[PDB]
Amino acid sequence: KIEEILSKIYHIENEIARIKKLIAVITSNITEVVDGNGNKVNIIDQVVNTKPDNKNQDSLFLTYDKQGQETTDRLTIGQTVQKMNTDGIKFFHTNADTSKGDLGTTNDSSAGGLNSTAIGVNAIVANGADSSVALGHNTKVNGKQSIAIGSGAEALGNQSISIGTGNKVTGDHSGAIGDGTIVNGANSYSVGNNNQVLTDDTFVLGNNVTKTIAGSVVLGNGSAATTGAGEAGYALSVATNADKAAITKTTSSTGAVAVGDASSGIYRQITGVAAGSVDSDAVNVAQMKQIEDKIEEILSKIYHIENEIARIKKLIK
Amino acid sequence: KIEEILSKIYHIENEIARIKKLIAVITSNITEVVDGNGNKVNIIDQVVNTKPDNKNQDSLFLTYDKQGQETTDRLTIGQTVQKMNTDGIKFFHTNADTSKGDLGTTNDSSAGGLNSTAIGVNAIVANGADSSVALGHNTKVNGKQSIAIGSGAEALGNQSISIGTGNKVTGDHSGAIGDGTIVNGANSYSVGNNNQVLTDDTFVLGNNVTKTIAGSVVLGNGSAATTGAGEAGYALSVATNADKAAITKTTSSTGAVAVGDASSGIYRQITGVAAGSVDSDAVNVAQMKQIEDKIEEILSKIYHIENEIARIKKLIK
Amino acid sequence: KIEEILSKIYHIENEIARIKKLIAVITSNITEVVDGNGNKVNIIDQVVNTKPDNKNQDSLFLTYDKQGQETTDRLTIGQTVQKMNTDGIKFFHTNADTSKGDLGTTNDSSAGGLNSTAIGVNAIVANGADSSVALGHNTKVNGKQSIAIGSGAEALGNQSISIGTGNKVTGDHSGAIGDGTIVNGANSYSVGNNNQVLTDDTFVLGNNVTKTIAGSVVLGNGSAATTGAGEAGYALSVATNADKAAITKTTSSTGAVAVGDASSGIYRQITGVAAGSVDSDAVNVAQMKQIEDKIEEILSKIYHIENEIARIKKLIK
Fold this sequence. Notes:
Largest interface: A-B, 146 and 136 residues
Assembly: trimeric
Entry title: Acinetobacter sp. Tol 5 AtaA C-terminal Ylhead fused to GCN4 adaptors (Chead)
Strand content of chain A: 15-25%
Chains A, B, C: Trimeric autotransporter adhesin
Structural class of chain A: alpha/beta
Distance between the termini of chain A: 186 Å
Order of helices and strands of chain A: HEEHEEHEEEEEEEEEEEEEEEEHEEH
Shape of chain A: rod-shaped
Strand order of the largest sheet of chain A: 7-9-11-13-15-17-19-20-21
Oligomer: homotrimer
Largest sheet of chain A: 9 strands, parallel
Keywords: TAA, Ylhead
PDB class: cell adhesion
């Protein structure tokens, strides 16, 4: 039947028009979608940058340059993400060499401690160094609640602080601010350069200090504490018993305050010193001068007495 | 008409071949696109990792492990992004517990101040603490232009600095480096452990220091400043009027330098001290020895005078 | 031939059914893919957030708020990435103003040195300042292996350390902790506020200190070191030759320890001082009292001698 054939052909013609219609809309249907605001978003434009422009501050592909405070627009979302990943995010940038790390294949930081933070090239917090902080190239922290900041700073004791270039703090509850200093003493602190602090409860504000005593305080370039407890003070042997005990009562109890190093010819005046009042207060030159002046007054009475006696001796004869 | 039917069939056959052609290219057309370099990019491969490989340093899906300096390759771009987001980017890693924060549901840092930076687990800069820095687990900064670094460091005054474990600095323009120290004084600084600094313009380089006076400086473990301005120096009552005023001229103006604590039997020698020159310079043992030696020379003239007088008295009779 | 026409029509009907089948599966085929775990992933859901929910901690679109420790769920992957990029990742947040930077169009940090790390708004490490660290608003570091932390801290010398508000350290191997301090001296350190340290190997633990001598140590608010090497100690002119040389042997070698400033009426007692033993040890009040007491004993013998002599003179007549 012709009419049966014609009807099949009309139907097919209708199916074909409908097919072409479907085909038409597929694309726009697959790539164009509505986000949760009701904005139509094109999936392709979210993944591939349709118009790169380093100056377009609204680009979803934008990166913040690690130096110079400008931006760079990337080609795909993955590129953007990996640039962030290696060159930094805004306000957090590390400019790195191509070295190998001490622990693994990268030169990443390594935050090994629970609640630890590690920042910078080869900045390492050890496993177990909990609540610790490393910030800087080659920093290393092995202690709990410890801090290393700087180039090669190491904070290796518990509650250790190491700020500056290449200080190494092994003492617990200890620290060093400066460069090239080592602190092995516990409860000991150094401010300055090239110090070595082996003793406990020791403080150094100085450079090139290497001789200390526990409990000591060393002040200034090249000073040295070499004395501690039990140094008998200088006393006049012609002194009374009560006066010798008052001196003895002030006998040293612990490491000295050192302001120089007589060994090596290093001596500092102490200036701006108020007259002492009580037994263990320092004495100033004014207080010594009153004594000197009295010595002179005594000497002058003696000279006169000697004069009198000489005359008396002659008068007798 | 047969020929009319045949023609419709040929046309349809042509439309069908053309349809299949269109269908063929759709895919490659939808997913394969050209970026701004003219590189063909496959959208799917930008979003889903076609070949995960922890060692493939060019992977767009790569993450930098928070410890150990190795990498991990992720399955999708969103996974990569969220790993960066929680485990860190290269050179910026915090290894966190699963705690709740003090402010909100996460244990994130919180940079509350304008131009502030907050880093680490529960590291908090308060609203209004502008230009401030917190770096470390449980750090808290409430002051403007303030710095807390370490485990539980708090910098609560304006221009306050707190570096180490659990120091708390409330004073303005003040700071503490060490562990367990509190500084409430304004314009006051402590280096050391378990100090308490309540006074202003006070400096401590020491541990276990808790007694201070405004303007004082306390040096060493257990030292204590308990005296300030207006301490009348020790003076010989047999001294002249000019000599008493020279002493009085050097009377203390402010808190002492304390190197010990006579109360508790703590005393330190001061060593390396150069001979004083002017009135408010400290005196050393060498300068006291010259006086002692003169006392002996005086005593020996007196002994001889007494001898003479005794003979004179007998000679008279 | 009818039968030839019918056969072409049956074939076309079969092609049409097959086409519609292909069309059906395209979508699901293009967008639904298998990742490297064998999980089926929908490409669209990786790029566009199908259900935003600020509380959904598994969202691939989640951001960590820069303050308050809560999260925000974003609409597309690019939004997420750029929020991370500008507002921070978890544990690394800077809350920034809308300023211009000193170097470029943004207010980003700038890590100019190899292996340097720069963090915070307008935190700048210069080109060539290698292995250096800047952390804080307006920090600037120009030296190698240098550290600036705080608001406007500058570390401009090599191995320079500057922590606090607006300190400026130009000296090499030098540093300042505090606020408003300048250190131009090399190998010199200041703890405190508004100090100016022009000299080398100089240490200040104090505020408002501006007069120093190389090698000096200045302790406390307003103290001033104005003397160095070669100060001849106070000596009794009535002293022996050996005693004058012992004093001369302790003559100052370098900058003083200053605890006050006699110029401006500033004087501090030094308290807790143990009796000195050797020549360059400080002397305390106890050691001066033994001398004073002996002066009195001498004066009393002299008074008696004078008495005797007066009687002798009368007895003779």
